[PDB]
Write a protein that binds this ligand. Structure first.
Ligand SMILES: Nc1ncnc2c1ncn2[C@@H]1O[C@H](COP(=O)(O)OP(=O)(O)O)[C@@H](O)[C@H]1O
Ligand SMILES: [Mg+2]
Length: 682
């Protein structure tokens, strides 16, 4: 019939109650030494299931894991963050629900120096034997007998450079006995609660989401049938390859969830730009003038960096189905981490500044003008870009706008609730673009990750459906892309035209500095001095032969699965080369290097159980083998690695391709008779 229940469900999704969240959190013990926030039985926790039967099933599984990650965040900030303590003067209190709203006073300079905002959780402590003689730290709170968690409800500036503070604590907390009028109480910030609150809002309002069925079942929509002429038109107009054009056309033509899988360098973001252009143009091409809200698209990413790259690349305009450029109105919701004028000019706050001018350079008028400008800018916008968390912001929540189409870049680098956040505005189509063949997003709680909390909705859905694969990479030398393609993509991952030309480098003319090489080192620990020495000698030969013609600044990375081996590698490289390699070589583990790339990559394999273990090794190898663009030199012991199918496949592929060389310390030295004898007798 007429579904005003859409408006009712929108209201439900946008107004989730946080009091149940703080009923739990405000009873926690800041001083607790445990992976877990309480002593409930371990069986209360369970793995994230491939398939959920109901929103209640989903919530029963997910809420403990969300709270566990939150607890681990508390612990991390307690044991590391070194937040600066302060003190407050207590006043009256008000009983609200299962809470006490305690009013207090603190200086504005202290609020600013300690970084306290209305989004912060803090811990209070009673330390009557403290004297200003000593410096106060969060260790004093960690070891205190009487502590209490409090949420910063309200911060209001007063006249004399002070701030009225409203803090919320739990009714049941005995610490209230110390909150007598005009008492001095010591405090320190624990953590800012915005992300936890937004994910909790999503988790609890899930049952009113339009795509709740597809989310619970991890089951994207079935493919519809699309016109080959349409795919060709998109290909030509947007200057894409066939896989990208197909992904765009299909994912836009259907509603529900769509998965686009992009291996390294296959054009995930370019395809998203094409999606934006195509969607907006085909949507604009559908007795007194009726007033309608303008169609918008929501573009989200897990991190500010990805959102900012999307914005920067959108500044060149988008294209319609016929290939003609148009410039839709773009708004970046939320301030970014880095400073850049090009991104700053797109932020909602800067757009409001420019729309209102110097008229209010009186305070009521200033706030009213800012609010009206915000409303108008958001109403006339075409594209809304944000982080997955930032999509839950009040500025979007008060637009009165349904965002029926949400696109997510880097969709594998976020938790499931985080990816679900932006669907609260009536989302009926969600196109997630990602690379599942990487390491899962990092979570603070090892236990939570052991319960598979570090798994993205993209991956959980990939279990049940085949994504639209982008199958041409535009980064790596063909000798470097060869084995990744054959080993992970059925030999169907293609190279862009001229990768051999683009990634041809002078040192390629000198053996063994080839584009692709496995060095079998002829010589139960997690380090290998001989691999380290061979890496040193390779880099030394490269430098000696070319660093008077080539600047190796930022050209080289060295990675290994094991941080012990990487520590030893950095130490030995520092000793051998001095400081002159600081700007030439990055050192990291395969995990820590996941988002980086170099022209030259050296891998120290060192050495090579379960399905989880094979999955982690599969992802690590996918990452490691795609970090280089022009040259990759894989150092390892063949017998120490061949117990792994992946490594044996790699070594035997290198053999078949004549890309295996035998190596030991001094193998590049013609005068080293010992090393040359070791080589010759092989
Ligand atoms: N159809 C295409 N034709 C030519 N170059 C492409 C195509 N698709 C992607 N590229 C190139 O591949 C590189 C990776 O682009 P990007 O969209 O950032 O990929 P991803 O987002 O998957 O990392 C870019 O330099 C881009 O110019
Ligand atoms: Mg990208």
């Amino acid at each position: 019939e007429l579904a005003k229940q859409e408006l009712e469900h929108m209201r439900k999704r946008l107004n989730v109650d946080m009091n149940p969240l703080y009923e739990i959190i405000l009873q926690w013990d800041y001083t607790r030494n445990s992976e877990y926030p309480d002593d409930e039985p371990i069986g209360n926790y369970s793995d994230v299931k491939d398939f959920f039967n109901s929103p209640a099933d989903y919530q029963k599984v997910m809420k403990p894991l969300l709270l566990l990650e939150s607890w681990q965040g508390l612990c991390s900030s307690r044991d590391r963050e070194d937040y600066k303590p302060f003190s407050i003067i207590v006043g009256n209190r008000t009983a609200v629900s299962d809470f006490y709203d305690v009013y207090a006073s603190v200086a504005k300079q202290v609020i600013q120096d300690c970084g306290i905002s209305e989004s912060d959780l803090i811990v209070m402590a009673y330390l009557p034997d403290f004297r200003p003689d000593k410096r106060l730290s969060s260790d004093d709170f960690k070891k205190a007998q009487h502590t209490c968690l409090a949420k910063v409800r309200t911060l209001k500036n007063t006249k004399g450079g002070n701030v009225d503070v409203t803090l919320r604590i739990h009714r049941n907390h005995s610490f209230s006995k110390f909150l007598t009028l005009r008492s001095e109480i010591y405090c320190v910030k624990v953590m800012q609660m915005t992300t936890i609150e937004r994910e909790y809002s999503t988790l609890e309002g899930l049952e009113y989401y339009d795509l709740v069925g597809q989310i619970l079942q991890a089951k994207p929509s079935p493919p519809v049938n699309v016109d080959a002429a349409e795919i060709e038109t998109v290909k030509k107009s947007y200057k894409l390859n066939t896989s990208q054009a197909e992904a765009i056309v299909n994912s836009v033509s259907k509603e529900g969830f769509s998965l686009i899988q992009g291996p390294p360098g296959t054009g995930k973001t370019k395809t998203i730009l094409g999606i934006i252009g195509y969607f907006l143009s085909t949507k604009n091409a559908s007795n007194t003038e009726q007033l309608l809200k303008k169609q918008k698209i929501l573009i989200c990413a897990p991190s500010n960096a990805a959102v900012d790259e999307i914005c920067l690349r959108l500044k060149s305009g988008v294209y319609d189905k016929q290939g003609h450029q148009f410039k839709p109105q773009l708004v970046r919701v939320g301030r970014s981490d880095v400073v850049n004028v090009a991104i700053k000019d797109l932020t909602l706050e800067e757009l409001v500044d420019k729309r209102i001018g110097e008229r209010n350079y009186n305070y009521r008028n200033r706030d009213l003008d800012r609010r009206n400008a915000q409303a108008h800018i958001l109403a006339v916008s075409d594209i809304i870009c944000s982080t997955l968390s930032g999509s839950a912001h009040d500025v979007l929540a008060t637009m009165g706008i349904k965002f029926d189409t949400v696109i997510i870049d880097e969709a594998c680098q976020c938790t499931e609730l985080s990816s679900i956040i932006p669907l609260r505005y009536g989302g009926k189509r969600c196109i997630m673009v990602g690379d599942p063949n990487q390491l899962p997003p990092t979570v603070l709680s090892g236990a939570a990750s052991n319960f598979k909390y570090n798994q993205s909705l993209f991956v959980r859905m990939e279990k049940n459906s085949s994504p639209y694969l982008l199958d041409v990479q535009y980064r790596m030398h063909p000798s470097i892309s060869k084995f990744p393609s054959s080993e992970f993509y059925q030999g169907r991952l293609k190279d862009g035209p001229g990768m051999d030309i683009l990634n041809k480098r002078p040192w390629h003319q000198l053996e063994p500095l080839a584009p692709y090489k496995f060095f079998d080192i002829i010589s139960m620990s997690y380090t290998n001095m001989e691999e380290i020495r061979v890496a040193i000698e390779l880099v030394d030969y490269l430098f000696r032969k070319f660093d008077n013609k080539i600047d190796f600044t930022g050209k080289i990375g060295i990675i290994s699965p094991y941080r012990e081996q990487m520590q030893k590698m950095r130490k030995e490289f520092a000793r051998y080369f001095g400081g002159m390699i600081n700007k030439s070589i990055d050192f990291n583990t395969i995990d820590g290097f996941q988002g980086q790339e170099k022209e030259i990559i050296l891998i120290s394999c060192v050495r090579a159980k379960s399905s989880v273990g094979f999955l982690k090794d599969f992802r690590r190898m996918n990452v490691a083998l795609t970090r280089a663009k022009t040259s990759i030199w894989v150092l390892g012991h063949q017998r120490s690695l061949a117990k792994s199918k992946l490594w044996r496949d790699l070594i035997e592929d290198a053999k078949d391709r004549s890309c295996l060389a035998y190596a030991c310390s001094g193998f590049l030295d013609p005068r080293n008779n010992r090393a040359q004898s070791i080589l010759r007798k092989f």
